[PDB]
């Protein structure tokens, strides 16, 4: 199993040009499914399955949650800035929260905030208190615990968040469980006296994947360079791995690609 629901909020003083100062996007199992920003002023579906399995009051309510959060975040930006004796400039509040459903049936919850890209405050593991990462968050810690905020977030994370995640996973079961095969290409580059072999996987899903370079049978990917897993625009992923080879010895290298969508692991040589 292992499903996830995540919301991430960005509130910035300096978006900037033609960009919304406030944004919230939601992800299920690592895939964007809802979106809200201060320009649209509306929560909006980003997958067909969320749009198909909700009614108008879902979007109207979420929209208003976002509009209210938008105001709350406007104020909180001002408050944090003041705690930092900041008078202007680029500053950002980020929030991350959500829940995991592991394939035990066990649950996990997270709620943490950053300020200017650094930890500011977070609800701790037991969800009974908040932990200030910086002295500037101490007063907030105090106010929240005096207001029973930990209890409130514990409730959302363990009940509301989880219950809704179960619905989302149900709604997009087919989409989330689909498989798409990557088209693989190996390409050879030469600008110096060093041969750069590249292997790219295009449009694979799900996310997990293995791409490696072998030098006549032996993974010689101990010195292969990966650009990691990066996203396409259509809900699939891309990855590319290179390796430097002595001119000559180009016919000794093979890229091997393992992925859940494949009939068998792909194995590809370079040929000019």
């Amino acid at each position: 199993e292992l499903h996830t629901l995540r919301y991430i909020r960005t509130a910035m003083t300096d978006p900037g040009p033609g960009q919304p100062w406030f944004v919230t996007v939601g992800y299920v199992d690592g895939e964007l499914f809802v979106h809200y920003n201060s320009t649209a002023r509306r929560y909006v579906p980003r997958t067909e399955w969320i749009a198909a399995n909700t009614d108008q009051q879902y979007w109207d309510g979420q929209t208003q949650i976002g509009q209210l959060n938008e105001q709350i975040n406007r104020e909180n930006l001002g408050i944090r800035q003041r705690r930092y004796n900041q008078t202007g400039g680029s500053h950002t509040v980020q929030w991350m929260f959500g829940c995991d459903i592991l394939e035990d049936g066990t649950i996990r919850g997270y709620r943490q905030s950053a300020y200017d890209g650094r930890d500011f405050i977070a609800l701790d593991k037991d969800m009974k208190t908040f932990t200030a990462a910086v002295p500037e968050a101490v007063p907030t810690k105090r106010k929240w615990e005096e207001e029973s905020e930990p209890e409130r977030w514990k409730n959302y994370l363990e009940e509301t968040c989880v219950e809704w995640l179960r619905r989302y996973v149900e709604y997009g079961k087919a989409e989330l469980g689909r498989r798409e095969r990557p088209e693989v290409r190996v390409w050879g580059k030469e600008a110096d006296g060093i041969l750069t072999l590249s292997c790219r996987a295009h449009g694979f899903y799900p996310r997990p994947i293995v791409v490696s370079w072998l030098k006549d049978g032996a993974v010689r990917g101990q010195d292969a360079h990966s650009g990691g897993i990066v996203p396409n625009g259509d809900g699939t992923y891309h990855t590319w791995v290179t390796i430097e080879a002595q001119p000559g010895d180009g016919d000794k290298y093979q890229c091997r690609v393992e992925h859940a969508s494949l009939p068998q692991p792909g194995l590809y040589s370079w040929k000019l």
């Binding site: 919301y7 909020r9 919230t24 939601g26 809802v34 809200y36 929560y43 879902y58 309510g61 979420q62 949650i65 976002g66 209210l68 959060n69 709350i72 975040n73 104020e75 909180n76 408050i79 944090r80 929030w95 929260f97 907030t140 106010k143 929240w144 207001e147 905020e149 409130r152 959302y156 509301t160 968040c161 809704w164």
Partner: peptide, 8 residues
């Protein structure tokens, strides 16, 4: 579903 942020 998204949820209310707390007031700071």
């Amino acid at each position: 579903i998204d949820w209310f942020d707390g007031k700071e």
